[PDB]
Amino acid sequence: ANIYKIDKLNNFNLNNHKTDDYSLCKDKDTALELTQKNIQKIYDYQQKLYAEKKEGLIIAFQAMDAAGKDGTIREVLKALAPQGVHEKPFKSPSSTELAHDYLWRVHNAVPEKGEITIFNRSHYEDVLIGKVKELYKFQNKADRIDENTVVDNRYEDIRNFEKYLYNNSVRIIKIFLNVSKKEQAERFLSRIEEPEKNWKFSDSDFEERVYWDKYQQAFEDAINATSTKDCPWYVVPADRKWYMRYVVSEIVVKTLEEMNPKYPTVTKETLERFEGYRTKLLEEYNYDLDTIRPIEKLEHHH
Amino acid sequence: NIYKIDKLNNFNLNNHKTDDYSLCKDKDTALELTQKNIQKIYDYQQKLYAEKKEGLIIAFQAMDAAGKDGTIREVLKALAPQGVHEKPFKSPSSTELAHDYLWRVHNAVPEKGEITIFNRSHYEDVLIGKVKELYKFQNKADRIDENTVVDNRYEDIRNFEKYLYNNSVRIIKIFLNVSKKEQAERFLSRIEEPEKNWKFSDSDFEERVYWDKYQQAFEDAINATSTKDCPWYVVPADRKWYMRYVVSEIVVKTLEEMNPKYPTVTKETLERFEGYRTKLLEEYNYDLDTIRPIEKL
Amino acid sequence: ANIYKIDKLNNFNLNNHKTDDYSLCKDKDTALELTQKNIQKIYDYQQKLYAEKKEGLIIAFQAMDAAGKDGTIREVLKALAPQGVHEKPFKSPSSTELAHDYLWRVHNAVPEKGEITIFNRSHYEDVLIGKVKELYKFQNKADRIDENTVVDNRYEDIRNFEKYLYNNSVRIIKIFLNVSKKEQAERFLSRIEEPEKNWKFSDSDFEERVYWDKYQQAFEDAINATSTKDCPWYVVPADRKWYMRYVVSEIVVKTLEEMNPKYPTVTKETLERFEGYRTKLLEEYNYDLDTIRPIEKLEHH
Amino acid sequence: NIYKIDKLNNFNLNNHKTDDYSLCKDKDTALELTQKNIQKIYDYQQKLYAEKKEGLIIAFQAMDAAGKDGTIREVLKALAPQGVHEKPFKSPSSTELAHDYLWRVHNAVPEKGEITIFNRSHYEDVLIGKVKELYKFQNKADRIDENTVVDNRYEDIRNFEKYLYNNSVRIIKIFLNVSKKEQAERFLSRIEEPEKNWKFSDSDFEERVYWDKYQQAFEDAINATSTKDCPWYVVPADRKWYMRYVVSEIVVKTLEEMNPKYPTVTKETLERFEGYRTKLLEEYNYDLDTI
Ligand SMILES: [Mg+2]
Ligand SMILES: [Mg+2]
Numbered sequence A: 001a002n003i004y005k006i007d008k009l010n011n012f013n014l015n016n017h018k019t020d021d022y023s024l025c026k027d028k029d030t031a032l033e034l035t036q037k038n039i040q041k042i043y044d045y046q047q048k049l050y051a052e053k054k055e056g057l058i059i060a061f062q063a064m065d066a067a068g069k070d071g072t073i074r075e076v077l078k079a080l081a082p083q084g085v086h087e088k089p090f091k092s093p094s095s096t097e098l099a100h101d102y103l104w105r106v107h108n109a110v111p112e113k114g115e116i117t118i119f120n121r122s123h124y125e126d127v128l129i130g131k132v133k134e135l136y137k138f139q140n141k142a143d144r145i146d147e148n149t150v151v152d153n154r155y156e157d158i159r160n161f162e163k164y165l166y167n168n169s170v171r172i173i174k175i176f177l178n179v180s181k182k183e184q185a186e187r188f189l190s191r192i193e194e195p196e197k198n199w200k201f202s203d204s205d206f207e208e209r210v211y212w213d214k215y216q217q218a219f220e221d222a223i224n225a226t227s228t229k230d231c232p233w234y235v236v237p238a239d240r241k242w243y244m245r246y247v248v249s250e251i252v253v254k255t256l257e258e259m260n261p262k263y264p265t266v267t268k269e270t271l272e273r274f275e276g277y278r279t280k281l282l283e284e285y286n287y288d289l290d291t292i293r294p295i296e297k298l299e300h301h302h
Numbered sequence B: 001n002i003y004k005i006d007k008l009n010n011f012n013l014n015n016h017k018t019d020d021y022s023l024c025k026d027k028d029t030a031l032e033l034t035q036k037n038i039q040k041i042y043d044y045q046q047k048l049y050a051e052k053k054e055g056l057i058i059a060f061q062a063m064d065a066a067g068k069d070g071t072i073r074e075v076l077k078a079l080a081p082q083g084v085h086e087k088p089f090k091s092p093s094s095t096e097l098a099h100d101y102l103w104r105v106h107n108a109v110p111e112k113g114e115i116t117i118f119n120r121s122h123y124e125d126v127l128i129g130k131v132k133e134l135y136k137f138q139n140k141a142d143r144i145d146e147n148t149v150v151d152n153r154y155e156d157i158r159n160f161e162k163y164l165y166n167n168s169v170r171i172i173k174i175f176l177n178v179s180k181k182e183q184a185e186r187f188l189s190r191i192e193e194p195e196k197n198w199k200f201s202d203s204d205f206e207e208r209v210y211w212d213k214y215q216q217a218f219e220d221a222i223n224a225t226s227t228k229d230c231p232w233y234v235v236p237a238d239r240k241w242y243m244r245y246v247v248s249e250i251v252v253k254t255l256e257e258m259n260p261k262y263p264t265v266t267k268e269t270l271e272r273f274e275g276y277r278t279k280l281l282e283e284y285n286y287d288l289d290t291i292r293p294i295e296k297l
Numbered sequence C: 001a002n003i004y005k006i007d008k009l010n011n012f013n014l015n016n017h018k019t020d021d022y023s024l025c026k027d028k029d030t031a032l033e034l035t036q037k038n039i040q041k042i043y044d045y046q047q048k049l050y051a052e053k054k055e056g057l058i059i060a061f062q063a064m065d066a067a068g069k070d071g072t073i074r075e076v077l078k079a080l081a082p083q084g085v086h087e088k089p090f091k092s093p094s095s096t097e098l099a100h101d102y103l104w105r106v107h108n109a110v111p112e113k114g115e116i117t118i119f120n121r122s123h124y125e126d127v128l129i130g131k132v133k134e135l136y137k138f139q140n141k142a143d144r145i146d147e148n149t150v151v152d153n154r155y156e157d158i159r160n161f162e163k164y165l166y167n168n169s170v171r172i173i174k175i176f177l178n179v180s181k182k183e184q185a186e187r188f189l190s191r192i193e194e195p196e197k198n199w200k201f202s203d204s205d206f207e208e209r210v211y212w213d214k215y216q217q218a219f220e221d222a223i224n225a226t227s228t229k230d231c232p233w234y235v236v237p238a239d240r241k242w243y244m245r246y247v248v249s250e251i252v253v254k255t256l257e258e259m260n261p262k263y264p265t266v267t268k269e270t271l272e273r274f275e276g277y278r279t280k281l282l283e284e285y286n287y288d289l290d291t292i293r294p295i296e297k298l299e300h301h
Numbered sequence D: 001n002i003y004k005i006d007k008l009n010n011f012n013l014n015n016h017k018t019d020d021y022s023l024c025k026d027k028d029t030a031l032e033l034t035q036k037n038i039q040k041i042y043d044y045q046q047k048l049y050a051e052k053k054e055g056l057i058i059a060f061q062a063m064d065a066a067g068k069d070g071t072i073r074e075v076l077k078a079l080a081p082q083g084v085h086e087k088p089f090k091s092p093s094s095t096e097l098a099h100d101y102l103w104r105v106h107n108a109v110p111e112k113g114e115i116t117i118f119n120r121s122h123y124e125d126v127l128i129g130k131v132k133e134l135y136k137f138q139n140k141a142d143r144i145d146e147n148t149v150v151d152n153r154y155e156d157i158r159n160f161e162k163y164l165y166n167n168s169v170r171i172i173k174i175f176l177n178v179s180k181k182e183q184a185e186r187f188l189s190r191i192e193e194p195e196k197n198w199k200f201s202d203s204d205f206e207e208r209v210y211w212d213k214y215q216q217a218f219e220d221a222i223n224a225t226s227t228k229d230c231p232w233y234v235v236p237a238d239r240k241w242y243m244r245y246v247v248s249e250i251v252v253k254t255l256e257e258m259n260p261k262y263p264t265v266t267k268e269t270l271e272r273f274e275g276y277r278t279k280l281l282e283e284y285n286y287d288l289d290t291i
Helices: A027-052 A069-077 A093-101 A104-108 A123-127 A147-166 A183-191 A195-200 A203-226 A241-259 A266-282 A294-299 B028-050 B068-076 B094-098 B103-107 B122-126 B146-165 B178-191 B192-200 B202-225 B240-258 B269-282 C028-052 C071-079 C095-099 C104-106 C125-128 C147-169 C181-193 C194-200 C205-227 C241-259 C268-284 D027-051 D068-076 D094-098 D105-108 D122-126 D145-163 D182-190 D194-199 D202-225 D240-258 D267-283
Strands: A056-062 A083-089 A116-120 A172-177 A234-236 B055-061 B084-088 B114-121 B170-177 B232-236 C056-062 C085-089 C115-118 C172-180 C235-239 D055-061 D084-088 D115-119 D171-175 D230-234
Touching: A027 A241, A027 D194, A056 A069, A056 A123, A056 A241, A056 C104, A069 A116, A083 D084, A104 B103, A116 C028, A123 A147, A123 A203, A147 A172, A147 A203, A147 B146, A172 A203, A172 A241, A183 A195, A183 A203, A183 B232, A183 D267, A195 D027, A203 A234, A203 D267, A234 A241, A266 D182, A266 D194, A294 B103, B028 B240, B055 B068, B055 B122, B055 B240, B068 B114, B068 B240, B068 D171, B084 C085, B084 C095, B122 B146, B122 B202, B146 B170, B146 B202, B170 B202, B178 B202, B178 C268, B192 C028, B192 D094, B202 B232, B202 C268, B202 D230, B232 B240, B269 C181, B269 C205, C028 C071, C028 C104, C056 C071, C056 C125, C056 C241, C071 C115, C071 C241, C071 D182, C085 D240, C125 C147, C125 C205, C147 C172, C147 C205, C147 D145, C172 C205, C172 C241, C181 C194, C181 C205, C205 C235, D027 D068, D027 D240, D055 D068, D055 D122, D055 D240, D068 D240, D122 D145, D122 D202, D145 D171, D145 D202, D171 D202, D171 D240, D182 D194, D182 D202, D202 D230, D230 D240
Parallel strands: A056 A116, A056 A172, A083 A116, A172 A234, B055 B114, B055 B170, B084 B114, B170 B232, C056 C115, C056 C172, C085 C115, C172 C235, D055 D115, D055 D171, D084 D115, D171 D230
Antiparallel strands: none
16 A cells, blocks of 8 residues: 555545655665666566557656656656657647547557557646636537536546546556645756756746646545546655656556566467477578577487 | 437337338338438538537447448438548457557547548447457456456446537437348348449358347347437338438437537627728728628728 | 640649639539539449449649638538548648648548548648748758758659559549639628628638738649649639539549449359359248349249 | 668669678677667757657668567667657558558658657568569559559659658668578577567468568669668678667767757747746745756
8 A cells, every 4th residue: 555556536635745755765876776676677577568469558647847757757768668659748739639529639549458658648637727727618519518517527537438448458557746836946947047958948837837726736636536446546756856766667667567467378289380380490401590409409410 | 219218228129120110101201301301411510510519420330231321321411521521340450459449439539510420330349249259369458357348348338428428429329220031132132233242241141140149239238328318229220211211310300409500709700800891892992792781981 | 624624734824714714614504404413423433433442532622712612512522422531621730730741641631442532722731821921931840951942842742742642543633713802802701791601701811811912823833833644733713603613523523434433343253152142041031032033933932 | 881772773682791790890899889879869869859850760671580679679779758659560451451552651750859660661562562462462443554563662652751851851771681591590589489489470481482582672672762861771680789789870870960959049038038037036035956
């Protein structure tokens, strides 16, 4: 029972989850090395997952600007080999995406069995900025859609979507990077003061600060309404980058371990065909190949 | 409607005969009524497209030669091409099987203001998928319990269709209920007319062996997923003229509940519009056709 | 059509193509009837095209606002059955579409063999509004892209793309609906004055009128640079709606007729299996089916 | 150099040996140089992603067990996940066959600022497509002349790749040139190690019968589609360490010609930014970490 894992409905108080907790590993150097170990194991699990083609994984990060989503995705999951991997940032919806229903663009990006898709922001956008700014009141919708129940029905629909995925061999890790307002300001200052990060800063990043408290409430309500055993939320303290990377590497490793991927074994009958192909290849080259069965090699002429 | 099912666990297939014609016994009457329904469907579609508020899926699920393509063609050829997609769900590709079963369906959901026609549907996964137990041969995670795969699909389908309803997309579900003898007559016709040979295949004939199991799978699907907001319509399919009539009635009545209207523009837009009108009139010295009086300053 | 078909490079003078020509059929009632005939034949060709699964067709309409694109697509092509048909309006590109290359969203919408896709506007937007407003100067691109060869390279690339399609069993009909500025103004007035058309008018429709002459020159240059025998341009006078509908029905019919679709005939071997299935079905029902060969029924009972 | 082909009709396969190692004969040296190249690739990728001006396709085309997956994995696992897609072109689906052959390729072309890796490519349609003459059995229009189908594909591919170039997308084309006996040793290894069985199939073995025809089809493709802007790289594939080294050099050298930079902001944005900085400082009692 992680102190950071939320696995039941209506069981979540945001004020109790401090942004600068570090209780799993107080020493930074220790955490950096444990993080390198976790990364090795992630890469190993990914190769087994890709080979088996049985289960898919979404790793979804949801948080305020400069909480640490891109830096964490980059530092922890750059371990992954390119095969089977997609990263999908959910930006402001296009005209076409708004003309469809809100889970249409999300479901499209769900991974294949054997593959991993990383979500930078997610379908939770529609009960975060969507609830705070009440965007549903300005968007086109049928007159029979009752505005007072739009948000409640998104919590239901999100629960049902995530459980649909679970039942069809796609897991989702949901990660809230819980950063404080002052730490966000320090990181914005850093985006302004360092040339190589200027591109990352925009007007509306600054202007969303005015809605800080409403966003905090909307995270609290979302996590209360969509945490289950099969689709838990993880609330990760985000004020220290080294710690936050450590904790995300732990969550990813532990989920891959429950999924327990293995290189597939081939059937009895395929194995027999395979032995026939082995003999043919060996005969083509008069047993001059590197077999791991040395005794048969000594049998044949040269 | 004797043909609408709008509640769970309320459906007996044996009571829904394939040759019922109780709504309209005279063929020539039904052909006339079908033409009026078609004109109204065209009118509603122009309003639905202009308003961009609600989407419609029209889904047809039935055995081979029940009448899906002939009905879609005769009833919905009235539709203008704008905002219209037709999507036949064939056997899944590799990529579709590597994704989850609703992935390819959700991708074809229409935009608000649009109509998408489904020839076969997500219901494939509790019909041929239940009868041939395809889930046992497909790749899936070890933790997936095979004994509950079908019940979980009924739940997930109900929840998916209610999600769509809540986000401005309706679905009409139509089961064309054809008898096995009538299927055989239509297959014979696909064999004996050159211009229909292309439509006949080996596996169409071979699926007849599974007739009864498919009938049970339709019964179970309709028991498990009929709701007020997402009803099933069980349409007798033994006569083409009757079946086209009934489908025209269902489509027209759904579009009328949706009640699309050309949008009215705000008072402020109307004022800018007047400014544009005066400019145009002045550019051409009042030598345009207007239906409204000209006031000058 | 034929005084209106352009099938050669650098062979196009827009001033010789009047917006109100009506020389193919001067009588409106005649043209309405000929249009209904063409429409039946289009539907018949479409069913054979769909059954054969050998060739695809793009029907692309490019023109100024209220030239008549939507109402022509609606009145002439609503004959088509829904199967195998898509309509794709090219609006201003999304973020994602701008981040990709300009033909990416067009090629995505190319139809399958046996199918018809209608383009309302097209890839030609990138040498029309794209040339007129020089949008390429503000868009993201690599430093090595030379700005004053961007448009010439689009003409080359468009020719090459269209020839690529032709070689892979997809034809394109390109139709320019050539409307006058005055007639556009009358139709805008009608969009403002009639309740049911208000939705169709926007601010920027009016403001683009200031660029009218530049747009006309850009259509001239495009047609000069991309008309070929296999990918011709059709310049259709658009000032009268009945005439424009008639002429477009003729272009679509004549193209479907060159494509010459046929219901496929099955191989000798498939025909024999089919006869075995026929006997089986007949036996299942002791010959009480509607065969086209009733003499065989006399043997049985 | 010896390995880059950048002109039409200038390519003799018999002169490009599978076990050449002339760029770096010492394996340990090549492993070290490979680590340096990989760090530089990561740095370039971050700048390419930030600038959103140019896209990069890295396409690998070769026989089974030439080394495509293991090279892609060992060299490009350095890359961060952001802006990266890997796309294997397997046998076309019935929907992909109902479209034209470049349709599924063009769909996967990357956005500006992004990198897409192709395992196999559009060249499939003049390799297995030429060798097995698949075009004769596929649906097409009656007017398509079968005797010119392949030459029109060379033209169309040249024009497609030139189109991409002109719209900010480069393609690296890499042929991993493996010998038949080395393929057999790697297939043997896929059969003898349980952990690799999944990688082996019946049809991998059966394609060997067409080895010579496939060699001729790679020769013809490289003759027909090598240009200055879209060159081919013929990389000897018989040793994995050497092949990974050379591919890291090609990717690095291409990123360096593209020359991505973190974008510079305008004078006016810099000033707004100063205003935001003072505000943030004032909101907190000047209590923030700054230079
Ligand atoms: Mg990586
Ligand atoms: Mg129609």
